[PDB]
Write an enzyme that holds these catalytic residues in place. Structure first.
Site, PDB file in Angstrom:
ATOM      1  N   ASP A 174      -3.129   2.538  -5.664  1.00  0.00           N
ATOM      2  CA  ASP A 174      -2.044   2.471  -4.698  1.00  0.00           C
ATOM      3  C   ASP A 174      -2.022   1.211  -3.823  1.00  0.00           C
ATOM      4  O   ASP A 174      -1.362   1.182  -2.770  1.00  0.00           O
ATOM      5  CB  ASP A 174      -2.138   3.678  -3.795  1.00  0.00           C
ATOM      6  CG  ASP A 174      -3.181   3.487  -2.716  1.00  0.00           C
ATOM      7  OD1 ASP A 174      -4.277   2.958  -3.019  1.00  0.00           O
ATOM      8  OD2 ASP A 174      -2.892   3.855  -1.566  1.00  0.00           O
ATOM      9  N   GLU A 175      -2.733   0.179  -4.259  1.00  0.00           N
ATOM     10  CA  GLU A 175      -2.812  -1.078  -3.511  1.00  0.00           C
ATOM     11  C   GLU A 175      -2.685  -2.282  -4.435  1.00  0.00           C
ATOM     12  O   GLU A 175      -3.331  -2.337  -5.480  1.00  0.00           O
ATOM     13  CB  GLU A 175      -4.170  -1.219  -2.790  1.00  0.00           C
ATOM     14  CG  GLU A 175      -4.364  -0.425  -1.497  1.00  0.00           C
ATOM     15  CD  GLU A 175      -5.802  -0.507  -0.978  1.00  0.00           C
ATOM     16  OE1 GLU A 175      -6.389  -1.619  -0.941  1.00  0.00           O
ATOM     17  OE2 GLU A 175      -6.349   0.550  -0.603  1.00  0.00           O
TER      18      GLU A 175
ATOM     19  N   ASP B 172       0.828  -1.200   0.000  1.00  0.00           N
ATOM     20  CA  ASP B 172       0.000   0.000   0.000  1.00  0.00           C
ATOM     21  C   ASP B 172       0.879   1.272   0.000  1.00  0.00           C
ATOM     22  O   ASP B 172       1.560   1.534   0.993  1.00  0.00           O
ATOM     23  CB  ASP B 172      -0.877  -0.089   1.244  1.00  0.00           C
ATOM     24  CG  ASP B 172      -1.808   1.072   1.409  1.00  0.00           C
ATOM     25  OD1 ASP B 172      -2.887   0.852   1.978  1.00  0.00           O
ATOM     26  OD2 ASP B 172      -1.468   2.190   1.004  1.00  0.00           O
TER      27      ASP B 172
END
Ligand SMILES: Nc1nc2c(ncn2[C@H]2C[C@H](O)[C@@H](COP(=O)(O)O)O2)c(=O)[nH]1
Ligand SMILES: [Ca+2]
Ligand SMILES: [Ca+2]
Ligand SMILES: [Ca+2]
Length: 341
Positions: free
Chosen positions: A105-106, A7
């Site tokens: 973003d993960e 993350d």
DNA sequence: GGGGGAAGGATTC
DNA sequence: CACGGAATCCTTCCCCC
């Protein structure tokens, strides 16, 4: 199975920091300016320097400026962040071909093969962390556990710029001690519904009559929470496929005037088509955010692909359908294309 | 009774 | 005062065997 979750820390703002390093150490607030009045809009994200004073995602830019009048306020540059993100994802793609790109973003990695036992997993995490920081100067938090949910939870507890493992012993500890609101997928709405049922911890879901749970939060959510409490959740890692592309904009004034909303709707359509690539959608939905921030939409699925002319034409009809069936004035207006050929 | 869509809404991140 | 954008899920409706 060993899942390693990655993350990126306060991503949008950290990217801005990377593109202008003199920003490091100062409060950075990435904003989505709506254009209704000076500083109208909300915070998309903020670095931790800003967050420790209350400035976080979701709060109005006006509120943030009252708390931190001297912080750096920057307009959101989605395209830039997305390209940086893609570069980071490719890099992880070389740590495994079993990858799930959950969002900008993960990402989840099934490193069940690339390693055995939690020692090597942790070592691999640092390898990933150092690799990303090296090649992109982006710090990220790594969460590692037996399934996707606890890997993410692990990251939630370690961020920012951390790494953590939740092994088969702590998983059980959390199942009875982790506040259920902190379980991924459980928002405020669901959190309250579960509180009213006497469920404050994952394990409590096993003391209720299932048919009651299903009745309150839906079957899917019910089986989800139950499986996690039985220590039986085991969804596979696999990047979903983009099933929809769309754009929604805020008008200067709330309106109900067609000839007044159109230019907004058309601009939404024009950007949506650019984003489409060579993808051809068979469904189109017009989405309107009403004056009381309520979301309403009308759509249509065609037996074939939609050309931009058809989209321009159908959207107007759908918009009229909305104005016709909903009295409230309109604040935001947009479109969404799906069911790609 | 129930498969299979489609539509509009609800929720989450 | 409160932006966006997308995925799941839900429930309702409908056609129809
Ligand atoms: N535009 C917008 N983006 C958000 C918000 N909250 C989180 N994000 C994005 C920031 C990026 C990603 C990080 O996870 O989620 C929000 O409230 N508004
Ligand atoms: Ca995240
Ligand atoms: Ca993040
Ligand atoms: Ca929560």
């Amino acid at each position: 199975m060993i899942v390693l979750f990655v993350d990126f820390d306060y991503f949008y703002a950290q990217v801005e920091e990377v593109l202008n390093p003199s920003l490091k150490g100062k409060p950075v607030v990435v904003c989505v300016f709506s254009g209704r009045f000076e500083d109208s809009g909300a915070v998309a994200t903020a670095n931790y320097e800003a967050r420790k004073f209350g400035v976080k995602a979701g709060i109005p830019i006006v509120e943030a400026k009252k708390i931190l009048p001297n912080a750096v306020y920057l307009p959101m540059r989605k395209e830039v962040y997305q390209q940086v993100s893609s570069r980071i994802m490719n890099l992880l793609r070389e740590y495994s071909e079993k990858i799930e790109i959950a969002s900008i973003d993960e990402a989840y990695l099934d490193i069940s093969d690339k390693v055995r036992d939690y020692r090597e997993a942790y070592n691999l995490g640092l390898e990933i962390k150092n690799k990303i920081l090296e090649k992109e100067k982006i710090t990220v938090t790594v969460g590692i556990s037996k399934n996707k949910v606890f890997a993410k939870i692990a990251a939630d507890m370690a961020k920012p710029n951390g790494i953590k493992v939740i092994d088969d012993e702590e998983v059980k500890r959390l199942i009875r001690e982790l506040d259920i609101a902190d379980v991924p997928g459980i928002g405020n709405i669901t959190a309250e519904k579960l509180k009213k049922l006497g469920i404050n911890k994952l394990v409590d879901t096993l003391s209720i009559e299932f048919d009651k749970l299903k009745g309150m939060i839906g079957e899917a959510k019910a089986k989800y929470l139950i499986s996690l409490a039985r220590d039986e959740y085991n969804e596979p890692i696999r990047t979903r496929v983009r099933k929809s592309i769309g754009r929604i904009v805020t008008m200067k004034r709330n309106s109900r005037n067609l000839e007044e909303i159109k230019p907004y709707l058309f601009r939404a359509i024009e950007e949506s088509y650019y984003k489409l690539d060579k993808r051809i959608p068979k469904a189109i939905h017009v989405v309107a955010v009403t004056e009381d921030l309520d979301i309403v939409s009308r759509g249509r699925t065609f037996p074939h692909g939609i050309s931009k002319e058809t989209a321009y034409s159908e959207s107007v009809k759908l918009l009229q359908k909305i104005l016709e069936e909903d009295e409230r004035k309109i604040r935001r207006i947009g479109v969404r294309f799906s069911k790609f050929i």
